[PDB]
Design a protein around this ligand. Structure first.
Ligand SMILES: CC(C)(COP(=O)(O)OP(=O)(O)OC[C@H]1O[C@@H](n2cnc3c(N)ncnc32)[C@H](O)[C@@H]1OP(=O)(O)O)[C@@H](O)C(=O)NCCC(=O)NCCS
Ligand SMILES: CC(C)(COP(=O)(O)OP(=O)(O)OC[C@H]1O[C@@H](n2cnc3c(N)ncnc32)[C@H](O)[C@@H]1OP(=O)(O)O)[C@@H](O)C(=O)NCCC(=O)NCCS
Ligand SMILES: CC(C)(COP(=O)(O)OP(=O)(O)OC[C@H]1O[C@@H](n2cnc3c(N)ncnc32)[C@H](O)[C@@H]1OP(=O)(O)O)[C@@H](O)C(=O)NCCC(=O)NCCS
Ligand SMILES: Cc1cn([C@H]2C[C@H](O)[C@@H](COP(=O)(O)OP(=O)(O)O[C@H]3O[C@H](C)[C@@H](N)[C@H](O)[C@H]3O)O2)c(=O)[nH]c1=O
Ligand SMILES: Cc1cn([C@H]2C[C@H](O)[C@@H](COP(=O)(O)OP(=O)(O)O[C@H]3O[C@H](C)[C@@H](N)[C@H](O)[C@H]3O)O2)c(=O)[nH]c1=O
Ligand SMILES: Cc1cn([C@H]2C[C@H](O)[C@@H](COP(=O)(O)OP(=O)(O)O[C@H]3O[C@H](C)[C@@H](N)[C@H](O)[C@H]3O)O2)c(=O)[nH]c1=O
Ligand SMILES: [Cl-]
Lengths: 186, 186, 186
């Protein structure tokens, strides 16, 4: 079976914008669909949470349990980006340092929230159980491994692993040739 | 949108005690609520689980996916403690050594469950995707980083990271001041 | 207060096979029950996902949030095997190298999915927040620590930790007697 909303159910959600062949679990949470644009051929799985400003392009899988906290600044994924299960992407984060109170029970003037657009460029893949922090551009074709923590921007076409991640090898570009192949045959 | 119970449904859950301005997700799970006590200005998000003895004070966020397995001995959080997404706090665990059978499918006399009260003191923040094992006090003002694992009590006012955690630098104490300033404020 | 199906609703799911004393959360997701079999005395908790080909023996707990993506080649667990919360087992994963396109939105010609049966032998325990990848045999009596990642088969009766896992000590085998002793009671 599957848990995906109908085309009929989907247009009732109220997305800023939703494309063709979009498959979204009835078990995801979508908060403020008003600020969420989704392109074509996108699958969002069980127990995802998308909240605040989120832009997804086309050909992207958001695997189960993944939370995207877009806040005001937003999270944007370009085409052919994918995110494996249990990832968190934060576009805002509280100050852990001891210099500020923390979290949504507390008025902003006591906190020191860090906020910044998070961008995943084309062909980015994020491995399972990973965390991406605010104000981070994940460069084109970057792979980050499972269980990775990314606190700053990542250079294009590299593979990274660890907490926090380190650059371990080049990502191959064959994928770009297959993109063009795939598209050409449509 | 939002997924919270109204103050009216909350009253029907049958909590040991629940204060005001409590926002609990309808997508969270609550088992044995008659041993669960929640103070004022608490938020518990989608997909959290609270099970068995759990005591939360005030000005606390339990972010999404976080499981608090309080068992019979309990987990207690003091005021201004917050737990980030996908954290687990166990007050009991099975013996992994090979010296016992394991899990809820096996009866106790063949197991060797390790149990003990867990306490998160005031101003503790627990980073996302972290695990706290039983019989542990997380010190006053401690921050535990993301993806960290805690098996022992932690000294006050430090930041710890890793699996298992190590101390990396003092937590700043400004928040004590901010706590007074904020509380004055009302 | 628990969230399990009755034995009656269980039969309405359409498992290849379901034993007795099987406690499955209504909050778990089960996809393609037709290829899933479960033996006796098994508990599957909230927000679990079982997808594709999955075979569970007896006396096994699959804890909250755990995802078993059995695909076509399958995941098998033998008796007395248990998986702690927020674990992922994959029988298939995409190629992260950059030599292929990725994920369920892309046709198979353009991908290079690696596939392989995952087997957990008797008495295996997998710690919370762990990830097991395809084509892996976890030998009998293996314990994998929390927050660990397994890409290769594991030697029987050892304890392994880390990302990727390294062997750290033997598992005790007192478990083997206890099993005999307990089964006698039955
Ligand atoms: C990143 C990954 C692609 C690396 O695979 P690889 O290219 O086969 O690299 P190796 O296995 O040789 O590892 C290279 C180095 O990185 C380390 N490493 C590999 N993956 C790591 C990870 N996730 N975290 C930390 N270290 C990692 C290895 O220990 C090795 O270190 P060394 O050079 O110090 O020995 C793979 O390990 C991974 O993390 N895959 C994620 C799969 C996934 O999440 N899939 C979702 C379902 S599609
Ligand atoms: C713990 C944290 C606050 C430390 O950040 P920082 O004070 O800026 O410290 P740095 O990034 O300089 O790192 C200091 C050391 O700890 C390591 N480190 C930092 N965070 C780590 C983590 N979570 N796990 C393991 N190692 C970590 C760094 O590698 C560095 O090691 P080194 O001195 O051996 O090089 C931050 O890394 C973190 O984990 N934040 C969690 C945020 C979160 O979960 N938010 C939830 C939503 S509000
Ligand atoms: C694997 C585990 C059982 C080991 O515990 P232990 O036998 O008491 O071993 P120790 O705590 O002495 O650690 C031994 C070594 O392994 C390292 N280690 C222990 N657990 C680790 C883990 N989960 N990840 C990485 N390293 C780990 C230690 O740092 C130590 O390293 P060193 O030899 O380099 O100093 C335990 O740490 C663990 O992970 N338990 C998982 C519990 C769980 O998930 N329970 C689910 C609820 S029932
Ligand atoms: C996870 C999930 C599955 N399903 C249904 C519909 C699907 O067609 C079917 C199988 O989905 P699946 O996710 O088990 O299998 P796949 O479609 O192969 O995808 C999975 O394996 C890949 C190698 C990974 N890259 C993905 O991250 C992982 O989700 O089950 C749902 O309806 N909702 C879900 O959340
Ligand atoms: C996650 C979640 C959200 N919501 C709704 C109600 C909320 O007011 C709204 C916004 O929630 P949000 O969590 O997206 O955004 P914030 O309210 O800023 O909270 C979040 O960012 C912080 C900087 C972190 N420290 C928190 O751990 C993180 O959860 O969405 C729910 O109703 N239920 C939920 O579980
Ligand atoms: C997690 C969960 C709990 N429950 C209900 C019925 C249960 O009998 C009761 C308590 O179960 P619990 O998981 O809170 O507690 P326990 O039955 O002790 O089990 C737990 O502690 C062990 C030491 C760990 N090995 C397990 O991984 C952990 O799940 O709550 C549910 O109905 N559904 C659930 O998903
Ligand atoms: Cl999760």
């Amino acid at each position: 079976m599957n848990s995906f909303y109908s085309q009929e159910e989907l247009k009732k959600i109220g997305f800023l914008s939703v494309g063709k062949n979009v498959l979204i679990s009835k078990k995801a949470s979508i908060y403020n669909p008003g600020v969420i644009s989704i392109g074509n051929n996108v699958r969002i799985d069980d127990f995802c949470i998308l909240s605040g400003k989120v832009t997804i392009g086309s050909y992207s899988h958001i695997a189960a349990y993944t939370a995207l906290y877009g806040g005001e600044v937003g999270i944007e994924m370009y085409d052919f980006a994918n995110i494996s299960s249990r990832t968190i992407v934060y576009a805002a984060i509280d100050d852990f340092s001891g210099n500020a109170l923390m979290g949504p029970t507390i008025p902003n003037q006591y906190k020191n929230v860090k906020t910044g657009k998070v961008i995943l460029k084309k062909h980015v893949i994020i491995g399972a159980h990973s965390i991406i922090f605010p104000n981070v551009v994940i460069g084109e074709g970057v792979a980050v491994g499972a269980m990775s923590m990314v606190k700053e921007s990542l250079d294009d076409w590299y593979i990274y692993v660890g907490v926090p991640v380190r650059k371990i090898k080049a990502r191959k570009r064959k994928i770009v040739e297959l993109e063009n192949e795939f598209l050409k045959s449509m």
